[PDB]
């Protein structure tokens, strides 16, 4: 029954509550994804360095349903509400048109959530910012970042991590058509990209790749070394 | 620091300053007097008449509610007019409930009740207008009440609010008050008007009066219309 | 600290005022100038269009309520058509219940009543518009200015909007020939007290003009761009 | 921890530092203004009620303007707060003496009526959005098993059981009074109440009244009915000093 | 602060005046009622090269015959244009015809100035719509263009441009505009546009346009008419 | 009312009659009762003359609402479901319909059948009406999926026509829709006698 | 009135939360209670509140709460608060069991929690739930686990992490000394009184001011023990001699 | 109506301060303490009025929850009869569900849950009332005591109000595990004549006790009497 307006229009046309939860998606982990022509994969900051970890449950890597899956940035509990509700209107709308549903309509239901709660009375707009990847009905491996302003776009590698604006630059440099073949060199790309940042995945990183609706498959830390030491050979 | 700006807020002395703000903002609106005699209660209103674009009557000051009670109102036209209607429907739920036509001490006390119930919260301000009612049943006696923007109801002879009350208290106080029979007084209130208009800068002091007596069997004319030319007849006693 | 009474319908300044209701009476004088009257027969509505923009419909300002009842908008826009939404939806439950014409001052009394509730209570800000309506009941044509501060008058010739003062010092001294003065005749002596709101250059154009015609044997009567066309006279040089 | 103020402590209901919430002692300030005055009379068969009452300008009507309301056939009350908040007090009263008779068959005992308004008042004083609302009740009455009973429940909800005690303006000097003349006889019967009632009055503010400006509301065991003197009769109980 | 539904010192409200800004940010769109036609043109301004440029929705089809061309704080319009086409498609079921364009205009501009912080239940808005956009739409009565604000204040509009260049844009449109399409007012507009030009040489790349003409429906251009147009400047 | 349908290797014809009774007495020989919710789609109507008409108008106007929201063709299985779902939460309610929901999208010819219990299934051929099973016997004999358009079209003309000659509630005209992939057409509007002339009985 | 919010719900221009890591101060301020599992079962072990002679019994202490036949929890921060909140999550074990008839797997029930507990952060305007509870459990899907929540939100399986303070004597020394493969849980208990046994002011560390609680089993059903008086002063003398 | 926010909130030391400034409201109330006895309880209170003026038989600060508990309080006034309000209400509840007498523990529970979210929930201030609690139930005794946080520990003795840690030290040094019976009346008589502003008036104190046959409050005679067994 709390009330009062929040998400206010400041002067200069300046939504400050949205912009602090652009720090708040700048104060995260450090998630990546490729749209790599027959498969997408994802990676982010490993955990920090398990030690003490379970790794079954420090999943920055989420499944909607089957096909689309998504690797929320900030504040890693505001974002399981909207994996939540992701998964149960997912299911709803299995249940009118019956697809294996369209990974944009999904997250436009995400990014007209959080625009919704950029509206209404007294609720604190996200801090989380999604890439929700996927296939559809004719493979087409679309990948969708959103915004805690609600914003989507179809992006390519959309690195919106912490330390991830030198990511996307360096991800803006070095993809051009080198990483259209299956699995390798896409990943070779992340694990590179995410090595640029911390160091070996040993301990770090943590990925998961969707080939052509089926076999959502992580990779333990098996993959992360391979893709790592592939990396270290190719530099 | 700062003890003001909500009705749920006391004084360090106990002084709930958003009614006594109310107070003086029906302190700088015009006079509305209401004289008690043992045949009904005459009331008559001032007006502060603006342009010439204004008619006759342009805002009414002297509701009625019941078929027999008055509403010489003083401050917010706004607020007074609001609670002037459900006046109405106050006694509309009266006889309605209980056949009986409102007494007006139970109406006073309701209406009465009802604006102070509205200064317990800071999620409503104060009303913005003193009220007066008045009305006569066949054995009632001439009843009428004063009320605030406190919410506080007494029984009067010849309350007086409005910006000139000062001077209004004073002349209703020298007029013989009990036993003259409301015809006289009529003609006697525009003595009390026009002595407490003190200007003739663009206000026109073109007043305007009602009552309810014997020669209207609990109800409410203007005043029929004939007064209007001979209470006007007491000019001069303003200017000599 | 400086100004306390800014969290403020529901709060008086420590004089009388209310510090923001008669800042919605500012939020009127602030909006486009218009003028309406009244004959002994039939009552007109005169209002200039502001053209803020390429070119435009001007935001067309008087508005079709009823079945004779027109009024005549200034201020905000979107809160002026919430209004006359509410004053047309009931104007028409007046049609279907009573099956009768709503009489003009209990149309304007309970909008009267419907504008005073956010005034009265928290953190809803009044209708910052300020009618100026207009029609014809049982008796004479009667014209209502109403106010963001819920307190409407029975008005004969009134004039509101931006520097809408001078307009009416016009009209206050040229009342003499109303209760006369048939529609031909009548709304020149409008439109020339509509002609010195405007800054002092300017002809009162066929764009920019829209009035409204209503009273006896005649339904509330829009004219348009076109129809303004066939008044035309004056100089006033004003 | 003392002077460190949680910010809105002289504003809202709520706990300041060393506890002592800024609203009700704000409150009990609040029925001091004007002033017009009771005392509570206690009798071993009739308690008595006094209240001095001042018009203005002999333009009220006197008859009118009163304290002394009548809540049911054998409970009255007198309050001396602001007379706004008065009758949105004696009016829930009636209202919870009415409600007891028709919920609870028998009429409603003096005790736990004082006890419910002092509930609402302290609902008052316990949510924020609301004042707590500034008068305190002196409400008599005779219930079948005990004798006359008063009470007084102030703006924060404390209803005591009192043997006589009246806070108007003037509280202390009163209760004093009392005091120092109570001691002489614990028993306390004085049915007459001729040299306690008015004597409280005129000895504490010294205007040793015409029957005009006091009310008296008195009960008694041989006739339950609350009843309001008119001056006749005070007229008779004021010669008698 | 204050609160929402409070009047500024200026005369204005406070939310409104400032919704008025964050109009001023965001990308720039401009439309041109014609005599055939109404056309719609907005440069979405891609933020970077390694992307897809095709899916940021700013010319939005309400209707076959209605198209809108929002612009400022986008994606919070989303919601009104919901209302937009689930009131089109109400008043086609319950009517059985077309629409006007005042109507549509009509129906999203009482959700403008339409919130606050304490009233109804909370599926009510707490701040304006933050977006300026205009119904590009063609009509029984003739194409024409709808120009909204946050306010509610909808207006008659031929010649209108939202956005940053609203100033420099809106007066280079005020002079090169008096005839009627004959299929150059498009080419004439992205000329508007190209003067406008922030990042790049207006490709079909960046650039989206539509034109709303009596014949058809619709047109969203798709890329090889939008080059083809390019490739005549 | 006889409607009947059939899809085969072009599409899927839909003819229906054209004749609303009252009980007994009779209101229009001209009934469209076919409604074209799309250039794409179709879907019929099967009594409860207001109740059927009301559901596909909102149902084409929630198809509309598909076709904006999601910019995308409707699938035939999204709009059978859904009109299945609303007039499933009217059962019970006295609500009596039924319909072909036919319609060519991108993986089949489509022929949906919802009624107002909330069948829908799917179909290869149908015949919903208040005779009806008429048009069953004689649709089956002739129907195989190995048919060209022609006698596809002469199949559904002597169907609902033995329908509505040997049926009281039935009749007047028939209209016949062969959709396919790209939408609906028109290829009829006779009424009986002109078949019954044409074809000798 | 606006004046008067706390405004609980409002984004640092920082980015983060004020009153939620307001909360994760208010646990280093009072909080204790780590726990370890093994191949076999999981323990809790606990401090209660001073040294005070005057508390006469606690059936179960104010620290170790019973949740269903399989599960349990421990709570750090303001007490008055968690109590509210294990009957509500008491309440969400029991009615999985009505929907379900399973004896509710700990993650859905950690998950359910924190997403009320979010709930309450979220929006509201109330100021959120000041404390870092934290849960063992064991279902038939996976083995023997613990997990550990916060006010702000997210959990996880923590094998070894205590809560409260000094975070280094508990818990940095424990990532020194867990062994991830096999545990034995006996010797866990000996790592939970070496680590107790570090982070306290006294040497009398018997369960006057030590509250343990072990979670074992026997022939399928899960066995809660609370671990009874004299076996404190057995592990208390298990030393005899050194630790560190 | 309403204000649907916390006004309790958390210190940027990290603890909440309206708790604290509850816990000194309470601690500048009437001091009151309260004995666990090996059959039975003693729960001990001290009405000190203004003046010798008031009815001491009219209010209590001993009364039971319609059963066999009794709870005495130290701090605000009125805020004691919510909560004894309340308390019945909820044993009413509770009785008319499980048809037993509540047990004590379960009692303390509820009271302790309702007075949680006046720590919370819109604009409610927190009671800063820490009401003790007593009880037979079966077999043992209980005692309890329910803070204005709402944290609660059952013990032997304490006390609570006025400078409570001498009745805490005080009660720490004369106790007994098998002091029963009118022996811990004697102390606690002896706890509140250590302060008490003089002279031990039957009529300012007033004594309750759960002797197996439910709570009762002591008539003044019996006060007096072992007032005069000084």
């Given at each position: 029954?709390?009330?009062?307006?929040?998400?206010?229009?400041?002067?200069?046309?300046?939504?400050?509550?949205?912009?602090?939860?652009?720090?708040?998606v700048?104060?995260?982990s450090?998630?990546?994804?490729?749209?790599?022509?027959?498969?997408?994969?994802?990676?982010?900051?490993?955990?920090?360095?398990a030690?003490?970890q379970?790794?079954?449950?420090?999943?920055?890597?989420?499944a909607?349903?089957?096909?689309?899956?998504?690797?929320?940035?900030?504040?890693?509990?505001?974002?399981?509400?909207?994996?939540?509700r992701?998964?149960?209107?997912?299911?709803?709308?299995?249940?009118?048109?019956?697809?294996?549903?369209?990974?944009?309509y999904?997250?436009?239901?995400?990014?007209?959530?959080?625009?919704?709660?950029?509206?209404?009375?007294?609720?604190?707009?996200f801090?989380?910012?999604?890439?929700?990847?996927?296939?559809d009905?004719?493979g087409?491996?679309?990948?969708?970042?959103?915004?805690?302003?609600?914003?989507?776009?179809?992006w390519?590698?959309?690195?919106?991590?912490?330390?991830?604006?030198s990511?996307?630059?360096?991800?803006?440099?070095?993809?051009?058509?080198?990483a259209?073949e299956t699995?390798?060199?896409?990943?070779?790309?992340?694990?590179?990209?995410?090595?640029?940042?911390?160091?070996?995945?040993?301990?770090?990183?943590?990925?998961?790749?969707?080939?052509?609706?089926?076999?959502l498959?992580?990779?333990?830390?098996?993959?992360?070394?391979?893709?790592?030491?592939?990396?270290?050979?190719?530099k | 620091?700062?003890?003001?700006?909500?009705?749920?807020?006391?004084?360090?002395?106990?002084?709930?300053?958003?009614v006594?703000?109310?107070?003086?903002?029906?302190?700088?609106?015009?006079?509305?007097?209401?004289?008690?005699?043992?045949?009904?209660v005459?009331?008559?209103?001032?007006?502060?008449?603006?342009?010439?674009?204004?008619?006759?009557?342009?805002?009414?000051?002297?509701?009625?509610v019941?078929?027999?009670?008055?509403?010489?109102?003083?401050?917010?036209?706004?607020?007074?007019?609001?609670?002037?209607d459900?006046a109405?429907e106050?006694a509309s739920?009266?006889?309605?409930?209980?056949?009986?036509?409102?007494?007006?001490?139970?109406?006073?006390?309701?209406?009465?009740?009802?604006?102070?119930?509205?200064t317990?919260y800071?999620?409503?301000?104060?009303?913005?207008?003193?009220?007066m009612?008045?009305?006569?049943?066949?054995?009632?006696?001439?009843?009428?009440?004063?009320?605030?923007?406190?919410?506080?109801?007494?029984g009067?002879?010849?309350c007086?609010?409005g910006?000139?009350?000062?001077?209004?208290?004073?002349?209703?106080?020298?007029?013989?008050?009990?036993?003259?029979?409301?015809?006289?007084?009529?003609?006697?209130?525009?003595?009390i008007?026009?002595?407490?208009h003190?200007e003739?800068?663009?206000k026109?002091?073109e007043?305007?009066?009602?009552?309810?007596?014997?020669?209207?069997?609990g109800?409410?004319?203007?005043?029929?219309?004939?007064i209007?030319?001979?209470?006007?007849?007491?000019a001069?006693?303003?200017?000599? | 600290?400086?100004?306390?009474?800014?969290?403020?319908?529901?709060?008086?300044s420590?004089?009388?005022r209310?510090?923001?209701?008669?800042?919605?009476?500012?939020?009127?004088?602030?909006?486009?100038?218009?003028?309406?009257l009244k004959?002994?027969?039939?009552?007109?509505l005169?209002?200039?269009?502001?053209?803020?923009?390429?070119?435009?419909?001007?935001?067309?300002?008087?508005?079709?309520?009823?079945?004779h009842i027109?009024?005549?908008?200034?201020?905000?826009?979107?809160?002026?058509?919430?209004?006359?939404?509410?004053?047309r939806?009931?104007?028409?439950?007046?049609?279907?219940?009573?099956?009768?014409?709503?009489?003009?001052?209990?149309?304007?009394?309970?909008?009267?009543?419907?504008?005073?509730?956010?005034?009265?209570?928290?953190?809803?800000?009044?209708?910052?518009?300020?009618?100026?309506?207009?029609?014809?009941?049982?008796?004479?044509?009667?014209?209502?200015?109403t106010?963001?501060?819920?307190?409407?008058?029975?008005?004969?010739?009134?004039?509101?909007?931006?520097?809408?003062?001078?307009?009416?010092?016009?009209?206050?001294?040229?009342?003499?020939?109303?209760?006369?003065?048939?529609?031909?005749?009548?709304?020149?002596?409008?439109?020339?007290?509509?002609?010195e709101?405007?800054?002092?250059?300017?002809d009162?154009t066929?764009?920019?003009?829209?009035?409204?015609?209503?009273?006896?044997?005649?339904?509330?009567?829009?004219?348009?761009?076109?129809?303004?066309?066939?008044?035309?006279?004056?100089?006033?040089?004003? | 921890?003392?002077?460190?103020?949680?910010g809105?402590?002289?504003?809202?209901?709520?706990?300041?530092?060393?506890?002592?919430?800024?609203?009700?002692?704000?409150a009990?300030?609040?029925?001091?203004?004007?002033?017009?005055?009771?005392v509570?009379?206690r009798?071993?068969?009739?308690?008595v009620?006094?209240?001095?009452?001042?018009?203005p300008?002999?333009?009220?009507?006197?008859?009118?303007?009163?304290?002394?309301?009548?809540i049911?056939e054998?409970?009255?009350?007198?309050?001396?707060?602001?007379?706004?908040?008065?009758?949105?007090?004696?009016?829930?009263?009636?209202?919870?003496?009415?409600?007891?008779?028709?919920?609870?068959?028998?009429?409603?005992?003096?005790?736990?009526?004082?006890?419910?308004?002092?509930?609402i008042?302290?609902?008052?004083?316990?949510?924020?959005?609301?004042?707590?609302?500034?008068?305190?009740?002196?409400?008599?009455?005779?219930?079948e098993?005990?004798?006359?009973?008063?009470?007084?429940?102030?703006?924060?909800?404390?209803?005591?059981?009192?043997?006589?005690?009246?806070?108007?303006?003037?509280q202390?000097e009163?209760?004093?009074?009392?005091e120092?003349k109570?001691?002489?006889?614990?028993?306390w019967?004085?049915?007459?109440?001729?040299?306690?009632?008015?004597?409280?009055?005129?000895?504490?503010?010294?205007?040793?009244?015409?029957?005009?400006?006091?009310?008296?509301?008195?009960?008694?065991?041989?006739?339950?009915?609350?009843?309001?003197?008119?001056?006749?009769?005070?007229?008779?109980?004021?010669?008698?000093? | 602060?204050?609160?929402?539904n409070?009047?500024?010192?200026?005369?204005?409200?406070?939310?409104?005046?400032?919704?008025?800004?964050?109009?001023?940010?965001?990308?720039?769109?401009?439309?041109?009622?014609?005599?055939?036609?109404?056309?719609?043109?907005?440069?979405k301004?891609?933020?970077?090269?390694?992307?897809?440029?095709?899916?940021?929705?700013?010319?939005?089809?309400?209707d076959?015959?209605?198209?809108?061309?929002?612009?400022?704080?986008?994606?919070?319009?989303?919601?009104?244009?919901?209302?937009?086409?689930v009131?089109?498609?109400?008043?086609?079921?319950?009517?059985?015809?077309?629409?006007?364009?005042?109507?549509?205009?009509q129906?999203?501009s009482?959700?403008?100035?339409?919130?606050?912080?304490?009233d109804?239940?909370?599926?009510?808005?707490?701040?304006?719509?933050?977006?300026?956009?205009?119904?590009?739409?063609?009509?029984?009565?003739?194409?024409?263009?709808?120009?909204?604000?946050?306010?509610?204040?909808?207006?008659?509009?031929?010649?209108?441009?939202?956005?940053?260049?609203?100033?420099?844009?809106?007066?280079?449109?005020?002079?090169?505009?008096?005839?009627?399409?004959?299929?150059?007012?498009?080419?004439?507009?992205?000329?508007?546009i190209?003067?406008?030009?922030?990042?790049?040489?207006?490709?079909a790349?960046?650039?989206?346009?539509?034109?709303?003409?009596?014949?058809?429906?619709?047109?969203?251009?798709?890329?090889?008419?939008?080059?083809?147009?390019?490739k005549?400047? | 009312?006889?409607?009947?349908?059939?899809?085969?290797?072009?599409?899927?014809?839909?003819?229906?009659?054209?004749?609303?009774?009252?009980?007994?007495?009779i209101?229009?020989?001209?009934?469209?009762k076919?409604?074209?919710?799309?250039?794409?789609?179709?879907?019929?109507?099967?009594?409860?003359?207001?109740?059927?008409?009301?559901?596909?108008?909102?149902?084409?106007?929630?198809?509309?609402?598909?076709?904006?929201?999601?910019?995308?063709?409707?699938?035939?299985?999204?709009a059978?479901?859904?009109?299945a779902?609303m007039?499933?939460?009217?059962?019970?309610?006295?609500?009596?319909?039924?319909?072909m929901?036919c319609?060519?999208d991108?993986?089949?010819?489509?022929?949906?059948?919802?009624?107002?219990?909330g069948?829908?299934?799917?179909?290869?051929?149908?015949?919903?009406?208040?005779?009806?099973?008429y048009?069953?016997?004689?649709?089956?004999?002739?129907?195989?999926?190995?048919?060209?358009?022609?006698?596809?079209?002469?199949?559904?003309?002597?169907?609902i026509?033995?329908?509505?000659?040997?049926?009281?509630?039935?009749?007047?005209?028939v209209?016949?829709?062969?959709?396919?992939?790209?939408?609906?057409?028109?290829?009829?509007?006779?009424?009986?006698?002109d078949?019954?002339?044409?074809?000798?009985? | 009135?606006?004046?008067?919010?706390?405004?609980?719900?409002?984004?640092?221009?920082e980015?983060?939360?004020?009153?939620?890591?307001?909360?994760?101060?208010?646990?280093?301020?009072?909080?204790?209670?780590?726990?370890?599992?093994?191949?076999?079962?999981?323990?809790?072990?606990?401090?209660?509140?001073?040294?005070?002679?005057?508390?006469?019994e606690?059936?179960?202490?104010?620290?170790?709460?019973?949740?269903?036949?399989?599960?349990?929890?421990?709570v750090?921060?303001?007490?008055?608060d968690?109590?509210?909140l294990?009957?509500?999550?008491?309440?969400?074990?029991?009615?999985?069991?009505?929907?379900?008839?399973?004896?509710?797997?700990?993650?859905?029930?950690?998950?359910?929690?924190?997403?009320?507990?979010?709930?309450?952060?979220?929006?509201?305007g109330?100021?959120?739930?000041?404390?870092?509870?934290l849960?063992?459990?064991?279902?038939?899907?996976?083995?023997?686990?613990?997990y550990?929540?916060?006010?702000?939100?997210?959990?996880?399986?923590?094998?070894?992490?205590?809560?409260?303070?000094?975070?280094?004597?508990?818990?940095?020394?424990?990532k020194?000394?867990?062994?991830?493969?096999?545990?034995?849980?006996?010797?866990?208990?000996?790592?939970?009184?070496?680590?107790?046994?570090?982070?306290?002011?006294?040497?009398?560390?018997?369960?006057?001011?030590?509250?343990?609680?072990?979670?074992?089993?026997?022939?399928?059903?899960?066995?809660?023990?609370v671990?009874?008086?004299?076996?404190?002063?057995?592990?208390?003398?298990?030393?005899?001699?050194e630790?560190? | 109506?309403?204000?649907?926010?916390?006004?309790?909130?958390?210190?940027?030391?990290?603890?909440?301060?309206?708790?604290?400034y509850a816990?000194?409201?309470?601690?500048?109330?009437?001091?009151?303490?309260?004995?666990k006895?090996?059959?039975?309880?003693?729960?001990?209170?001290?009405?000190?009025?203004?003046?010798?003026l008031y009815?001491?038989?009219?209010?209590?600060?001993?009364?039971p929850?319609?059963?066999?508990?009794?709870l005495?309080?130290?701090?605000?006034?009125?805020?004691?009869?919510?909560?004894?309000?309340?308390?019945?209400?909820?044993?009413?509840?509770?009785?008319?569900?499980?048809?037993?007498?509540?047990?004590?523990?379960?009692?303390?529970?509820?009271?302790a849950?309702?007075?949680?979210?006046?720590?919370?929930?819109?604009?409610?201030?927190?009671?800063?009332?820490?009401?003790?609690?007593?009880?037979?139930?079966?077999?043992?005794?209980?005692?309890?005591?329910?803070?204005?946080?709402?944290?609660?520990?059952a013990?032997?003795?304490?006390?609570?109000?006025?400078?409570?840690?001498?009745?805490k030290?005080?009660?720490?040094?004369?106790?007994?595990?098998?002091?029963?019976?009118?022996?811990?009346?004697?102390?606690?008589?002896?706890?509140?004549?250590?302060?008490?502003?003089?002279?031990?008036?039957?009529?300012?104190?007033?004594?309750?006790?759960?002797?197996?046959?439910?709570?009762?409050?002591?008539?003044?005679?019996?006060v007096?009497?072992?007032?005069?067994?000084?």
């Open positions: 029954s709390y009330d009062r307006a929040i998400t206010v229009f400041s002067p200069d046309g300046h939504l400050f509550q949205v912009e602090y939860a652009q720090e708040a700048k104060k995260g450090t998630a990546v994804g490729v749209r790599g022509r027959d498969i997408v994969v994802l990676g982010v900051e490993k955990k920090s360095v030690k003490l379970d790794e079954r449950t420090v999943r920055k890597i989420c909607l349903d089957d096909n689309v899956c998504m690797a929320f940035a900030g504040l890693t509990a505001d974002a399981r509400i909207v994996i939540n992701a998964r149960v209107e997912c299911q709803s709308h299995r249940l009118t048109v019956e697809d294996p549903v369209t990974v944009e999904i997250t436009r239901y995400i990014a007209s959530l959080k625009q919704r709660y950029t509206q209404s009375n007294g609720r604190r707009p801090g989380i910012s999604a890439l929700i990847v996927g296939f009905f004719d087409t491996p679309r990948l969708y970042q959103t915004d805690p302003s609600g914003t989507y776009h179809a390519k590698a959309n690195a919106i991590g912490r330390g991830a604006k990511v996307r630059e360096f991800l803006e440099k070095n993809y051009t058509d080198d259209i699995d390798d060199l896409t990943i070779k790309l992340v694990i590179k990209a995410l090595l640029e940042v911390v160091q070996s995945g040993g301990k770090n990183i943590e990925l998961a790749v969707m080939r052509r609706d089926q076999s498959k992580i990779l333990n830390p098996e993959e992360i070394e391979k893709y790592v030491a592939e990396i270290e050979k190719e | 620091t700062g003890y003001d700006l909500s009705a749920s807020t006391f004084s360090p002395d106990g002084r709930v300053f958003q006594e703000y109310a107070m003086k903002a029906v302190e700088n609106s015009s006079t509305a007097i209401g004289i008690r005699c043992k045949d009904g005459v009331f008559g209103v001032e007006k502060l008449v603006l342009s010439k674009l204004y008619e006759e009557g342009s805002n009414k000051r002297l509701f009625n019941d078929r027999h009670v008055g509403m010489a109102v003083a401050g917010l036209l706004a607020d007074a007019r609001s609670l002037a459900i109405r106050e739920n009266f006889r309605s409930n209980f056949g009986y036509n409102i007494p007006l001490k139970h109406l006073a006390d309701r209406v009465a009740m009802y604006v102070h119930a509205y317990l800071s999620a409503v301000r104060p009303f913005g207008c003193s009220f009612l008045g009305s006569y049943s066949v054995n009632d006696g001439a009843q009428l009440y004063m009320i605030d923007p406190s919410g506080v109801s007494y009067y002879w010849g007086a609010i910006k000139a009350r000062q001077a209004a208290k004073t002349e209703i106080e020298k007029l013989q008050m009990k036993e003259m029979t409301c015809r006289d007084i009529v003609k006697e209130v525009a003595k008007i026009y002595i407490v003190d003739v800068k663009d026109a002091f007043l305007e009066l009602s009552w309810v007596g014997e020669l209207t069997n109800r409410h004319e203007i005043v029929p219309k004939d209007r030319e001979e209470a006007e007849k007491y001069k006693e303003s200017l000599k | 600290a400086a100004n306390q009474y800014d969290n403020d319908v529901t709060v008086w420590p004089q009388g209310i510090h923001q209701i008669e800042y919605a009476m500012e939020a009127v004088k602030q909006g486009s100038a218009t003028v309406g004959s002994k027969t039939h009552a007109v005169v209002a200039l269009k502001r053209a803020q923009s390429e070119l435009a419909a001007h935001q067309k300002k008087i508005l079709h309520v009823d079945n027109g009024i005549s908008i200034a201020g905000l826009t979107a809160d002026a058509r919430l209004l006359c939404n509410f004053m939806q009931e104007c028409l439950d007046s049609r279907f219940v009573f099956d009768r014409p709503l009489p003009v001052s209990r149309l304007v009394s309970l909008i009267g009543s419907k504008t005073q509730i956010p005034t009265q209570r928290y953190g809803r800000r009044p209708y910052g518009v300020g009618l100026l309506i207009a029609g014809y009941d049982d008796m004479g044509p009667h014209i209502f200015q106010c963001p501060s819920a307190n409407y008058f029975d008005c004969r010739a009134m004039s509101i909007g931006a520097r809408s003062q001078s307009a009416r010092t016009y009209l206050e001294r040229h009342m003499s020939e109303f209760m006369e003065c048939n529609l031909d005749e009548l709304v020149k002596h409008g439109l020339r007290a509509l002609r709101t405007l800054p002092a250059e300017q009162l066929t764009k920019n003009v829209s009035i409204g015609i209503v009273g006896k044997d005649l339904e509330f009567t829009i004219y348009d761009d076109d129809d303004v066309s066939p008044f035309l006279d004056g100089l006033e040089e004003r | 921890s003392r002077g460190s103020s949680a809105f402590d002289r504003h809202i209901t709520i706990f300041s530092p060393e506890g002592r919430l800024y609203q009700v002692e704000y009990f300030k609040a029925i001091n203004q004007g002033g017009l005055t009771s509570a009379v009798g071993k068969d009739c308690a009620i006094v209240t001095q009452k001042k018009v300008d002999k333009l009220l009507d006197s008859s009118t303007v009163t304290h002394l309301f009548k049911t054998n409970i009255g009350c007198v309050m001396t707060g602001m007379t706004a908040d008065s009758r949105s007090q004696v009016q829930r009263a009636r209202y919870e003496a009415a409600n007891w008779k028709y919920k609870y068959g028998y009429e409603i005992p003096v005790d736990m009526l004082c006890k419910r308004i002092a509930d008042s302290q609902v008052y004083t316990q949510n924020a959005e609301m004042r707590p609302l500034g008068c305190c009740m002196i409400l008599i009455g005779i219930d098993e005990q004798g006359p009973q008063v009470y007084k429940c102030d703006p924060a909800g404390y209803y005591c059981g009192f043997k006589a005690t009246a806070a108007g303006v003037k202390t009163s209760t004093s009074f009392l120092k109570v001691k002489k006889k614990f028993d019967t004085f049915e007459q109440t001729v040299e306690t009632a008015i004597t409280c009055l005129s000895t504490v503010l010294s205007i040793d009244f015409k029957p005009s400006e006091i009310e008296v509301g008195v009960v008694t065991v041989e006739n339950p009915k609350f009843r309001i003197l008119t001056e006749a009769e005070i007229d008779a109980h004021l010669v008698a000093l | 602060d204050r609160g929402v409070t009047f500024s010192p200026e005369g204005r409200l406070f939310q409104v005046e400032y919704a008025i800004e964050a109009i001023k940010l965001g990308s720039t769109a401009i439309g041109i009622q014609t005599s055939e036609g109404v056309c719609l043109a907005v440069e301004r891609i933020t970077s090269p390694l992307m897809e440029p095709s899916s940021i929705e700013k010319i939005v089809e309400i076959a015959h209605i198209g809108c061309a929002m612009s400022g704080l986008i994606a919070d319009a989303k919601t009104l244009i919901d209302k937009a086409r009131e089109t498609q109400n008043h086609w079921f319950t009517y059985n015809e077309t629409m006007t364009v005042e109507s549509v205009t129906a999203v009482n959700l403008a100035l339409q919130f606050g912080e304490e109804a239940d909370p599926g009510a808005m707490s701040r304006p719509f933050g977006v300026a956009l205009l119904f590009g739409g063609v009509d029984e009565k003739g194409p024409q263009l709808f120009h909204m604000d946050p306010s509610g204040t909808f207006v008659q509009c031929d010649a209108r441009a939202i956005g940053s260049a609203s100033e420099g844009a809106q007066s280079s449109l005020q002079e090169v505009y008096h005839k009627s399409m004959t299929l150059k007012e498009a080419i004439k507009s992205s000329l508007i190209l003067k406008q030009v922030m990042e790049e040489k207006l490709n790349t960046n650039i989206e346009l539509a034109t709303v003409q009596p014949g058809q429906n619709f047109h969203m251009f798709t890329k090889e008419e939008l080059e083809e147009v390019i005549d400047i | 009312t006889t409607t009947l349908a059939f899809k085969f290797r072009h599409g899927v014809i839909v003819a229906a009659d054209s004749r609303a009774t009252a009980g007994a007495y209101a229009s020989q001209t009934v469209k076919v409604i074209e919710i799309n250039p794409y789609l179709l879907g019929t109507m099967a009594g409860g003359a207001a109740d059927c008409s009301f559901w596909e108008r909102l149902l084409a106007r929630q198809c509309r609402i598909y076709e904006l929201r999601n910019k995308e063709r409707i699938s035939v299985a999204a059978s479901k859904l009109l779902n007039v499933y939460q009217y059962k019970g309610m006295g609500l009596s319909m039924g319909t929901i319609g060519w991108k993986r089949g010819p489509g022929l949906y059948y919802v009624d107002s219990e069948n829908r299934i799917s179909g290869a051929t149908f015949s919903v009406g208040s005779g009806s099973v048009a069953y016997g004689v649709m089956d004999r002739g129907y195989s999926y190995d048919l060209e358009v022609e006698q596809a079209y002469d199949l559904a003309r002597r169907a026509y033995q329908a509505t000659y040997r049926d009281a509630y039935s009749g007047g005209a209209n016949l829709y062969h959709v396919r992939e790209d939408g609906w057409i028109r290829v009829s509007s006779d009424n009986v006698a078949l019954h002339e044409k074809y000798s009985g | 009135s606006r004046r008067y919010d706390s405004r609980t719900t409002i984004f640092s221009p980015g983060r939360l004020y009153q939620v890591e307001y909360a994760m101060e208010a646990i280093g301020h009072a909080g204790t209670c780590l726990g370890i599992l093994a191949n076999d079962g999981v323990l809790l072990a606990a401090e209660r509140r001073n040294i005070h002679k005057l508390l006469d606690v059936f179960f202490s104010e620290k170790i709460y019973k949740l269903n036949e399989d599960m349990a929890c421990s750090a921060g303001i007490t008055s968690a109590n509210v294990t009957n509500e999550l008491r309440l969400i074990a029991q009615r999985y069991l009505l929907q379900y008839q399973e004896p509710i797997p700990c993650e859905q029930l950690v998950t359910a929690l924190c997403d009320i507990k979010q709930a309450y952060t979220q929006f509201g109330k100021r959120p739930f000041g404390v870092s509870l849960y063992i459990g064991w279902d038939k899907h996976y083995g023997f686990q613990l550990q929540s916060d006010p702000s939100g997210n959990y996880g399986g923590w094998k070894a992490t205590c809560i409260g303070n000094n975070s280094a004597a508990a818990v940095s020394m424990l020194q000394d867990y062994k991830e493969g096999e545990m034995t849980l006996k010797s866990a208990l000996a790592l939970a009184i070496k680590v107790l046994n570090k982070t306290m002011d006294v040497s009398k560390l018997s369960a006057e001011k030590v509250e343990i609680a072990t979670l074992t089993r026997e022939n399928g059903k899960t066995v809660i023990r671990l009874k008086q004299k076996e404190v002063e057995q592990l208390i003398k298990k030393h005899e001699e630790e560190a | 109506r309403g204000y649907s926010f916390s006004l309790t909130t958390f210190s940027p030391s990290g603890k909440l301060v309206q708790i604290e816990l000194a409201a309470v601690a500048g109330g009437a001091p009151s303490v309260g004995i006895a090996a059959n039975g309880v003693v729960l001990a209170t001290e009405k000190k009025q203004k003046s010798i009815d001491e038989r009219s209010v209590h600060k001993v009364e929850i319609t059963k066999h508990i009794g005495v309080y130290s701090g605000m006034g009125p805020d004691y009869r919510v909560l004894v309000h309340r308390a019945r209400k909820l044993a009413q509840q509770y009785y008319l569900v499980y048809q037993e007498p509540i047990p004590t523990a379960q009692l303390v529970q509820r009271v849950s309702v007075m949680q979210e006046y720590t919370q929930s819109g604009g409610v201030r927190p009671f800063g009332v820490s009401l003790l609690i007593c009880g037979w139930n079966e077999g043992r005794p209980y005692l309890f005591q329910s803070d204005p946080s709402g944290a609660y520990f013990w032997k003795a304490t006390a609570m109000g006025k400078n409570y840690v001498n009745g030290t005080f009660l720490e040094k004369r106790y007994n595990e098998d002091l029963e019976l009118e022996d811990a009346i004697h102390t606690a008589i002896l706890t509140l004549k250590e302060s008490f502003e003089g002279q031990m008036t039957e009529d300012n104190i007033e004594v309750g006790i759960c002797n197996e046959a439910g709570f009762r409050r002591l008539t003044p005679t019996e007096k009497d072992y007032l005069a067994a000084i």
